[PDB]
Each structure stands twice: as C-alpha cells, then as structure tokens.
Ligand binder design. Sequence first.
Ligand SMILES: Nc1ncnc2c1ncn2[C@@H]1O[C@H](COP(=O)(O)O)[C@@H](O)[C@H]1O
Ligand SMILES: Nc1ncnc2c1ncn2[C@@H]1O[C@H](COP(=O)(O)O)[C@@H](O)[C@H]1O
Ligand SMILES: [Ca+2]
Ligand SMILES: [Ca+2]
Ligand SMILES: [Ca+2]
Ligand SMILES: [Ca+2]
Ligand SMILES: [Ca+2]
Ligand SMILES: [Ca+2]
Ligand SMILES: [Cl-]
Ligand SMILES: [Cl-]
Lengths: 201, 199
Amino acid sequence: HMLENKLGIINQLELNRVEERVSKENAKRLYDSGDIDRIEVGTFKGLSYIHNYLFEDIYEFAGKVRSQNISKGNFRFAPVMYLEIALEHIDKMPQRNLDEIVAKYVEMNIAHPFREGNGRATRIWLDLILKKELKRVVDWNLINKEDYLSAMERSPVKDLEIKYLISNALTDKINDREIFMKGIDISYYYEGYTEYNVDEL
Amino acid sequence: LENKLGIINQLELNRVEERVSKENAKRLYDSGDIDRIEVGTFKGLSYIHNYLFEDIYEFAGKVRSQNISKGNFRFAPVMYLEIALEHIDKMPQRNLDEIVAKYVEMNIAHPFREGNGRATRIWLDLILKKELKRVVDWNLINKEDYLSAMERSPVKDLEIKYLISNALTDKINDREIFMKGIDISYYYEGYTEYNVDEL
Ligand SMILES: Nc1ncnc2c1ncn2[C@@H]1O[C@H](COP(=O)(O)O)[C@@H](O)[C@H]1O
Ligand SMILES: Nc1ncnc2c1ncn2[C@@H]1O[C@H](COP(=O)(O)O)[C@@H](O)[C@H]1O
Ligand SMILES: [Ca+2]
Ligand SMILES: [Ca+2]
Ligand SMILES: [Ca+2]
Ligand SMILES: [Ca+2]
Ligand SMILES: [Ca+2]
Ligand SMILES: [Ca+2]
Ligand SMILES: [Cl-]
Ligand SMILES: [Cl-]
C-alpha cells in the first residue's frame, strides 16, 4: 500500500526510484536554468514553486496546500482546519539571523503543507533564506542523517539540536554547483532515496 | 558508527553496507542456510544478524554494550538485555497474537547496535512460516504505516498486527516473495540502490 501517483505505480520500490529520477532531474534543471534564483525567498509561494517544480510529473498534489491530515512517528503536522492561516503567519515570521531562520524553518516543518515531499522542498527553501540573509548555505554532507531526523523530531519542542547542526554545517560557497548537487543527494538520502546521483540528467 | 572497512562518508557507508549485507541476504536464502537455523530464539536472530553484517560490523550478531534511544523511546537497558532475551526465548508463538507480541518484545529489546529492523523482520518471517505456514508480502505494508505502527507497538500492537495480518501470504517457498521482501525491508531503512536478486 502506497501514495496515489500520476503514473499508476502499485510497487513501493518502483515509485521510490521513479520519483527520485523524475524529481532529481527537475532539481538539476531548477539550478542550471537559474529558475532557482527567480523564486520568492522565505514565503509559502516560493516553497509551493519549489515543490511543484520537483513533483509536477509524479504527483497531482505538487505545490498544493494538502486537504488531508498527515503525521510522522508520534507527531501530527498542522491540522487542515487551520493549515492556511498558520501558513499566512509563517510568511510574516522574521528571518534576520540564524536563530530566526531556524525558528521559521521549524514552523514550516510543523505546517508540513504538502501530502509528501515536505522535507526535500523545505531544505531547498531554507538554503535560499540562508543565502539571502547570511550569505551562507548548508553543506548537508556535514550533518549525519540520524542526527538530522532526530533533531527535527525534537524541533517542535526544542530547536537547539537542529540549530547547532545547521550552524556548524553553514558554508560561504553560495554559488557552488557541487555544494548544491551533493546537498540534493544528501537531502534525498535523508528521505530514503539512494538510487541516483543528481549529476546525471 | 565504526565499520571494519574504515568508511568515513555516510552516503558511501550506506551503499557499501547495502551491497555487502544484501549479497549476504541473497546467499542466506539461496544456500538454504536460512532454514538450517533456530526459529524464534535469540540464537537464530544473532545468526541472521551475523550473516548479514559480519563483513561490515565487528558487533555483528553481538548484543550491544551501549544504550539506545529512538525519539522519546528507550530500548531495553544494556544491564537487563541478557535477562530480557532469555524471557523472549520463552515467549509462545502458537498464533498471530503470540507471534506479533514476541516480535514487539524483541523490537523493545533491540539487542544490536544497528540492523535490528532488517535482521528481526527475517526472524519474524521464519516464525510465521513454521507456526502459521504464512510469510509477509512486505510490499502490502507501507513504509510509514509500518514505522508508525512499530513506534506505537509498545503501547498497543493493534496497528502492526493489522498490517502483518493483511499482508500474510501462503507462498512459503516463493523465492520472488522472499527477495521482494528483503528489498522492501532495506527500503524501510532507506537503502534503495540494489535489487537483492541481481547480486
Ligand atoms: N517525527 C517528526 N516530527 C517532526 N518533523 C519530522 C518528524 N520526522 C521527520 N520530520 C521532518 O519531515 C521531513 C520529511 O518530510 P515528509 O516526508 O513530507 O514527511 C524530514 O526531513 C524532517 O524534516
Ligand atoms: N521509536 C521507535 N520505537 C520502536 N521501534 C522503532 C522505533 N523507530 C524504529 N523502530 C524499529 O527499529 C527498526 C530499525 O532498527 P535499527 O535501525 O537497528 O534501530 C525499524 O525497522 C523498526 O522496527
Ligand atoms: Ca517522504
Ligand atoms: Ca547508482
Ligand atoms: Ca559476504
Ligand atoms: Ca567475509
Ligand atoms: Ca538503521
Ligand atoms: Ca540500482
Ligand atoms: Cl520528503
Ligand atoms: Cl535495520
């Protein structure tokens, strides 16, 4: 049993691998065409664009505010009954420093506005806030998978674990294709996608 | 995590760990060694774990010496592991309710540093096969439904029991069912590069 998709795939392994190829392919194009730099920074509109850009081919819900309730582990993400107003309040949150950018990122993860693909899209969106505001981007290879997922699970209660991780992984190489491309490979790895290397179209 | 091959990169250790242990999982089955071992004991679980990770981890098939936590859940304390595993061995396994309860306790014990999910799911299928003449068609269980049901299982095993019951197959000697199951088991832990049968 799995997520409804456009391509009518009924095998979990099959969907995981094809989603990874169509979406990482899109992620490569997003960076290379410079479409990435024309996107609105720190807003839901910007996140929505990143999400639709990646999952347009495989998912009907790509870039849309979900109409269903979702959860991971023992945590329920922002209920549909107030998800939209909660998103309007995230758009207004300041992003003037790391403590603020991390707090805003933690709230956007709680909102979790999409049916699936929240993690990957919100990590691209965060890197552009850090790029704009601190002239820093994350080197996702410096953060261990287990450490990241554990910090995010804790983040609705105390964001110090994820703050320390982002802080110690920040790099000044803001226009480096390798830092981005590797970060995409590490981002997908966090979500359990390990078949492709983004380098290849 | 420290490995035998001295791998420092996380992505590198992930695909090497997958290659090596999945090739071992294929050989475990194809040699028929899988059916030569003890069903429902820590001895059998320990054999399965050693068989999978003996090339990569020094701790393969060995009981952990450090305490572990997943979220706000603490697994069996290292000091009580020996006692807990002896009690699990004594747990009945006559029907699905008993088999699932045994599996749930074994997951709470989590006797190894790493690879509990993968080694215990193989162990579970062998208890199901011996006692019910059923095995799990793991594709019929969503990754996140499975993971959420496992995290819930110490409080209520209704969720995981429901997933296991609705995925039971009588294809006990089906190699394709076993192989697809290993690939899904590894995918549950985030390893999606290889197909076990292509090794
Ligand atoms: N239990 C949790 N509580 C809060 N955030 C979580 C939890 N588990 C995972 N996450 C976040 O959710 C992302 C996955 O996005 P998705 O697959 O759409 O749910 C991860 O990359 C984390 O940022
Ligand atoms: N919070 C949790 N509570 C109980 N069992 C869990 C939890 N998270 C994961 N698991 C189980 O742990 C396995 C992963 O094993 P390992 O990576 O060795 O710790 C999964 O396949 C689940 O069966
Ligand atoms: Ca996901
Ligand atoms: Ca490959
Ligand atoms: Ca070997
Ligand atoms: Ca060897
Ligand atoms: Ca693991
Ligand atoms: Ca492959
Ligand atoms: Cl995701
Ligand atoms: Cl595992």
